[PDB]
């Protein structure tokens, strides 16, 4: 097998993962912003960046925000829609949670969310989290409501990449 560090090294070499901001380091114990995770999804699934389009009203969500082209791409793809469809808030500085990451990866991999799942996930996420656990993207002992650690996101991204390659529909 590969260690989490080796999985990070591989994904970094592939341009999918970056160091914890301010570093080139795995920092496997640290959290990740939804902005950073949008970029991970774009690189992981080979999505096209969308420049000069703004679908959200978050403060400092504009042409000067490095994350906008990635956030627009995952929005167009239907992987993410943000946290509030009235105020159009993505919460790009918010930390990506296990169940949020579960939704994005389940959606990207075309996996069926589990109906009437019984788990500790937020109501909207129960089916997404259940499908992610069933597919081996996260452990059943992961807290769906917790901020995902970079270790959990590296393991999930690596597993998602292996599933995509093995399905014969890799980008």
Token representation of residue 43: 């690189």
Which of 29, 63, 85, 112 lies at the binding interface for ligand D2Y (CB under 6 A)?
85
Of 47 and 80, the one with the shorter C-beta distance to ligand D2Y is 80
The length of the chain in residues reads 171
Of 26 and 58, the one with the shorter C-beta distance to ligand D2Y is 58
Binding of ligand D2Y by 1 (CB under 6 A): no
* Selected range binding ligand D2Y among 5-13, 16-24, 65-73, 75-83, rule: CB under 6 A: 75-83
**How far is residue 83's CA from residue 157's CA, in Å, rounded to a whole number?**
22
Give residues with Cβ within 8 angstroms of 15, minimum separation 6.
Answer: 43
Of 104 and 149, the one with the shorter C-beta distance to ligand D2Y is 104
Binding of ligand D2Y by 80 (CB under 6 A): yes
Name the 3-class secondary structure at 8.
helix
Binding of ligand D2Y by 83 (CB under 6 A): yes
- HSE-up (13 A, CA, CB side) for residue 92: 24
CA-CA distances (angstroms) from residue 58 to 20, 84, 109? Answer: 23, 10, 28
Task: Name 33's bridge partners.
Answer: 95
* Selected range binding ligand D2Y among 12-20, 25-33, 99-107, 147-155, rule: CB under 6 A: 99-107
Binding of ligand D2Y by 66 (CB under 6 A): no
Name the 3-class secondary structure at 167.
helix
Of 26 and 108, the one with the shorter C-beta distance to ligand D2Y is 108
Summarize as ranges the residues that interact with ligand D2Y (CB under 6 A).
80-83, 85, 100, 103-104, 124
């Amino acid at each position: 097998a590969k260690t989490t560090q080796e999985k990070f090294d591989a994904l970094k070499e592939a341009g999918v993962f970056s160091g914890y901001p301010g570093t080139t380091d795995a920092k496997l114990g640290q959290d990740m912003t939804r902005a950073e995770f949008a970029k991970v999804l774009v690189k992981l699934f080979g999505l096209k960046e969308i420049h000069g389009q703004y679908s959200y009203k978050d403060k400092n969500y504009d042409a000067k925000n490095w994350a906008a082209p990635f956030i627009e791409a995952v929005t167009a793809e239907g992987l993410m829609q943000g946290k509030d469809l009235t105020k159009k808030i993505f919460d790009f500085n918010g930390k990506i949670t296990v169940e949020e990451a579960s939704k994005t990866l389940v959606t990207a991999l075309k996996l069926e969310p589990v109906k009437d799942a019984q788990n500790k996930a937020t109501d909207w996420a129960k089916g997404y989290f259940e499908a992610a656990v069933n597919a081996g993207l996260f452990s059943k002992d992961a807290n769906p409501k917790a901020n995902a650690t970079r270790a959990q996101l590296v393991e999930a991204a690596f597993a998602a990449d292996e599933m995509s390659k093995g399905s014969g529909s890799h980008h």
